[PDB]
Design a protein around this ligand. Sequence first.
Ligand SMILES: [Mg+2]
Ligand SMILES: [Mg+2]
Ligand SMILES: [Zn+2]
Ligand SMILES: [Zn+2]
Lengths: 399, 398
Amino acid sequence: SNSQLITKLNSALQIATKANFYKDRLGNIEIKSLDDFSKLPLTTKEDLRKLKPMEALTVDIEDLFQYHESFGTTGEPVSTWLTEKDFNAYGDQLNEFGVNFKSTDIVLNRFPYAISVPAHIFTNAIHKKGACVIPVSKASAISPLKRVANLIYKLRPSILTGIPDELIKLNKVAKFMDISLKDLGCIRAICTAGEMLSEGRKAKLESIFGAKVYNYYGCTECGNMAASCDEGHLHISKDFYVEILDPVTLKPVKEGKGKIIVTTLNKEAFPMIRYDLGDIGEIKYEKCSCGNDRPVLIHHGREIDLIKTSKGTITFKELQEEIFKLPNSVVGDVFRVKIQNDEVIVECEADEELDNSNSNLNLPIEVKIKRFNHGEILNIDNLIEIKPIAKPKYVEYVD
Amino acid sequence: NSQLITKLNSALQIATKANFYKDRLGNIEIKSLDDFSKLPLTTKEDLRKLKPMEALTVDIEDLFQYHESFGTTGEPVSTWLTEKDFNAYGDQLNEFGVNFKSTDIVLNRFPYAISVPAHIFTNAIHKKGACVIPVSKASAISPLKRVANLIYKLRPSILTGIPDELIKLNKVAKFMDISLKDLGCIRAICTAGEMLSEGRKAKLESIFGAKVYNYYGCTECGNMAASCDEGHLHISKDFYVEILDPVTLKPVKEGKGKIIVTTLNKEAFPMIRYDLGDIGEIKYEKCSCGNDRPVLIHHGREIDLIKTSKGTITFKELQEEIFKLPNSVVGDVFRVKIQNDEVIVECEADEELDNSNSNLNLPIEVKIKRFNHGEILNIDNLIEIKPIAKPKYVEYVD
Ligand SMILES: [Mg+2]
Ligand SMILES: [Mg+2]
Ligand SMILES: [Zn+2]
Ligand SMILES: [Zn+2]
């Protein structure tokens, strides 16, 4: 049934248009098809920024339950009220695919509970299956990586969750503490989210931790649009309608990569009608061997993370996919990307310098691997510090 | 008493599931509070020596949350919780305290990192249908400047945070030309995690123009007590509180003493006669609030006692007298130095006090040393905003 999906898209509009923002550019216009839908104006990040938090609201103050934002201080941020239902929906989305949380599971939650949502909805999800949350958080004086390393050694949790960046550092700090988190033999699964994950970097994470990885694709304003199957592919949540548009035309593509627009099927506080995530990807419709009937998504990363020389363009994913076919000797787990004077330079902490003259990348553009020394791009001494913290110290005996 | 005694016994029967408690309590029953008071105290330093699996009376399946001493300075105390237990903690916050309505938007300035107050306040607030703004604390993500803007923008109806932070919040905000009081949106405050004199409570109320509710709790127990409308803490029904003599360690007949607590309603690892290391006293005069539960007077930590040769006072008693002085000579920023057998209170304030004819109505000598605003507490340290964003892996050069 398109009949259902179309019923839903319409509901979403009827709620949305409770709010000035949505009414003064969608009125009471109904729709009869996806194509008639695709005629409707996109909703941009920069649109929502201009909104007071009371302008980003389709429910009564009474139904408010949580609040969230852009964690980033760089750029005006986006109010995202949630009702209990909405919050609970987000959580269910994490459970819809992803790893199978058991009650016997103890889960180290390394996502920031400060203002972001992934921390909170993962908790929601995990509690739902009867498992235990260790609220370590992130970017808190309270829980630097040394402590997290000790926490894992001590508590032996069965699942780690954290943005793949932090998880790579965690393993570095821990290895500098003479701890192989992998050999503990207690971590069966990982939950990455908050940055795009190549199959190459996913396979890196799996080799480090010796665990299966489940990746979760979401955002504050929407919820969690997709997550990994056992086979490794993201799948799209039933609570969303995902379109792939052409960067320039802004029309549905016939196939292949494109801008990722999402509409909320199941969020009532302020629904996302055709929201421009600003990412790149593609929906496949071949049924995954996992057996799940929902459609697979290939995430190519953010739009600004496209690699554009004169001689072509590639997605950050495509770049990464090729980087990480090279040995760890030449690439490693710490890298950044400079595009300058019409060349692509990947700077990598690694032991060996690469031929480059015999690099033999299978990309439509030229990419060089510039070698660095471990610790030069990522300073380990910055991560190992522990600030002592406690309650205020008001009463001093000078003895 | 038959109820309370039934409960104390249950607590022991669970507790002794754990070697820690069994190898010093066996299956000993009790018939009275007095027979209870014969049992060995449980100390902070006791629990520290426990592996997290040794601090556990339930199966891994029933585990739900985990927590610790937030400080990275000093070995920490494992505190598992089951869903029930967590839910109990929350209910304790709701048992007295402020009355959370569904029309309430609450800025939650407690750290969600490892501590519990942040999480159980959320629990409580959701329970009444109100909205949580999870600002947290000690996170790069949420410096005071942002919190000030967040309040200006979202106009929340309730702030929650340790009174120290809340005093700073108002400083940072006032330096940003924002009077949080004149917003007209904050009706209530929820202090916790440090002791609160009636004088400092009244200070907070003057700053924010809101009523204060204080909450007295700890990670291992839950939240043992919270304020009534009248101002007085009351003890939660989920706990048995004793006041012991500092030296003898026997029930006192009346007055101040060491505060020991037993968990009536926590099953993962119950606190049997736990030494908080605080000082206080139970009154049984009924508060005019009409709540029948007994009032508690919190005097602060033991190490925060003021001991000269010429006597001794509680941090509260000291504070209570400090803050009867004009605002001109005592503000909201103070510290306490005891040196060469004198008590010096250093205060940011405009006027110097005529200590040569000082009022102070205490059994010991206490001098008020005047300082300039911003010299004890540097506002410039707090106004910084650290830029944070996702990782930045792709750079276009030039
Ligand atoms: Mg469990
Ligand atoms: Mg509400
Ligand atoms: Zn699949
Ligand atoms: Zn009362």
